[model samples]
Target: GPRLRKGRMMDVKKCGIQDTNSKKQSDTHLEET
Candidate 1:
């Protein structure tokens, strides 16, 4: 159970990172346009 929980948490963190990067990229694109 602990290992499963840890894996889930890591996945959540990766998702968060992806979301933040996506927002930054979107903002940059808007600025360029």
Candidate 2:
């Protein structure tokens, strides 16, 4: 470990409308949301 600089942006926040639910969605087998 070492001294930190600036601020960390790791899992700090989330969106209120992060995802959607509807018909005819698009995605892949090896992908992340």
Candidate 3:
């Protein structure tokens, strides 16, 4: 659901999007799909 995406997005932003790295992007993309 949207929760995972939002959570990952939150993590990304918290980590400074530039450092979103792999896991965060992975979850966000996975959730989007």
Candidate 4:
């Protein structure tokens, strides 16, 4: 069960990183020139 827990933690971390990047892009006001 420890391995399963670790895997889930990693998945959550990855999802969080993706979300953070998405949020940053959304917050930027400059459009592509």
Candidate 5:
């Protein structure tokens, strides 16, 4: 099935997301750096 959203900010602030999207420091992580 498919989904749709309205009037919402999924990443609001992103507050911060997975920069670990790659691999390195100068970043933030829940585990080791």
Candidate 6:
């Protein structure tokens, strides 16, 4: 659902996104799939 992507920073904690190394890489990982 869009929730996952919308959550972004909020979702990063529990979601698959881990912006620990680099936050700018957000689009890079999201656009991955």
Query: In candidate 6, what are the lDDT values of residues 1-33, reduced to their tens digit?
Result: 444534435545565765665634464457433
Best by lDDT: 5
lDDT (C-alpha) at residue 6 in model 2: 86
lDDT of 2 by residue, 1-33 (tens): 998898867655765433375434456545334
Clashes of each: 0, 0, 0, 0, 0, 0
Estimate the TM-score for candidate 2. Answer: 0.18
List model 4 lDDT by residue over 1-33, tens digit each: 444433333555454544443433456686644
**Where does candidate 4 stray beyond 4 Å?**
1-25
Candidate 3 per-residue C-alpha lDDT over 1-33 given as tens digits, one digit per residue, 9 for 90 to 100: 444433333555465555354444453446533
Each candidate's root-mean-square deviation in Å?
A: 8.7, 7.4, 12.0, 8.6, 8.4, 11.2
lDDT of model 4 at position 10 = 52
Off by over 4 Å in 3: 1-10, 16-33
User: What is candidate 3's TM-score against the reference?
Assistant: 0.14
Error of 4 at 10 (Å): 21
Candidate 3 — what's its lDDT?
Answer: 0.47
* Model 5 agreement with the true structure over 1-33: per-residue lDDT tens digits: 779868775777656676656665455555554
TM-score of each: 0.14, 0.18, 0.14, 0.16, 0.16, 0.19
Candidate 1: segments with Cα more than 4 A from true spot:
1-10, 16-33
**lDDT values of the candidates?**
0.45, 0.56, 0.47, 0.47, 0.63, 0.51
Of the two candidates 2 and 3, the one with more favorable TM-score, higher being better, is 2
**2 or 4: which has the higher lDDT?**
2
Instruction: State in Å the error of residue 22, model 1.
Output: 19
- Clashing residue pairs in candidate 6, if any? none
